[PDB]
Amino acid sequence: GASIVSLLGIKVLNNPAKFTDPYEFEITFECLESLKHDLEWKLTYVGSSRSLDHDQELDSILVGPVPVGVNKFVFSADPPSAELIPASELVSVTVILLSCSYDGREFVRVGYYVNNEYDEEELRENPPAKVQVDHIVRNILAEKPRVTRFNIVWD
Ligand SMILES: [Br-]
Ligand SMILES: [Br-]
Ligand SMILES: [Br-]
Ligand SMILES: [Br-]
Ligand SMILES: [Br-]
Ligand SMILES: [Br-]
Ligand SMILES: [Br-]
Ligand SMILES: [Br-]
Ligand SMILES: [Br-]
């Protein structure tokens, strides 16, 4: 049948923000019938393939047992370790992926580009090799999400 769960709404909260501030999304979804499993929402920091920071699962939350109908919650996750961020992640945009899975099967993914920019000109012109995370302003490009749905088996 149709997907048991549909994504109805997503709001990126507290954006822009310090690099060290939690990511926060207010999510509205609906669930059409009772499910055996909870939903697993997770946020993945895609990072940079050249470094040791890539494809990090920041946090997950088990949501359920989900009452049939419209549901709303806030997904929060702390940012990845400042210790692993390479200087290139200021230069080029990075990606964060908010996804939901059911019994390990991903059925919806929302991707966002994230522009990290130093908050003073000298840093922007002459960025230090030791990434000064405390001077990064994180801007999630919230008006250009990439939403992908996957057809999964439910129960
Ligand atoms: Br709203
Ligand atoms: Br808020
Ligand atoms: Br409603
Ligand atoms: Br994507
Ligand atoms: Br910059
Ligand atoms: Br945007
Ligand atoms: Br489906
Ligand atoms: Br689908
Ligand atoms: Br499947």
From Swiss-Prot:
- The domain of life is Eukaryota
Q: How the protein is affected by changing residue 95 to R?
A: Abrogates interaction with histone H3 and histone H4, abrogates transcriptional silencing, reduces acetylation of histone H3 on 'K-9' and 'K-56' and enhances sensitivity to HU and MMS
Q: Which GO terms describe its cellular component?
A: chromatin; chromosome, telomeric region; cytosol; H3 histone acetyltransferase complex; nucleus
Location of region: Interaction with HIR1: 3-144
Q: Which GO terms describe its biological process?
A: cellular response to stress; chromatin organization; DNA replication-dependent chromatin assembly; negative regulation of DNA damage checkpoint; nucleosome assembly; nucleosome disassembly; positive regulation of transcription elongation by RNA polymerase II; protein modification process
Q: Where is this region: Interaction with histone H3, histone H4, RAD53 and the RF-C complex?
A: 3-155
What does the UniProt record report as the effect of altering residue 109 to E in this chain?
Answer: Reduces transcriptional silencing
Q: What is its main location?
A: nucleus
Q: Function of this protein?
A: Histone chaperone that facilitates histone deposition and histone exchange and removal during nucleosome assembly and disassembly. Facilitates histone deposition through both replication-dependent and replication-independent chromatin assembly pathways. Cooperates with chromatin assembly factor 1 (CAF-1) to promote replication-dependent chromatin assembly and with the HIR complex to promote replication-independent chromatin assembly, which may occur during transcription and DNA repair.
User: Which family does the entry's similarity section mention?
Assistant: Belongs to the ASF1 family.
Q: What's the protein name?
A: Histone chaperone ASF1
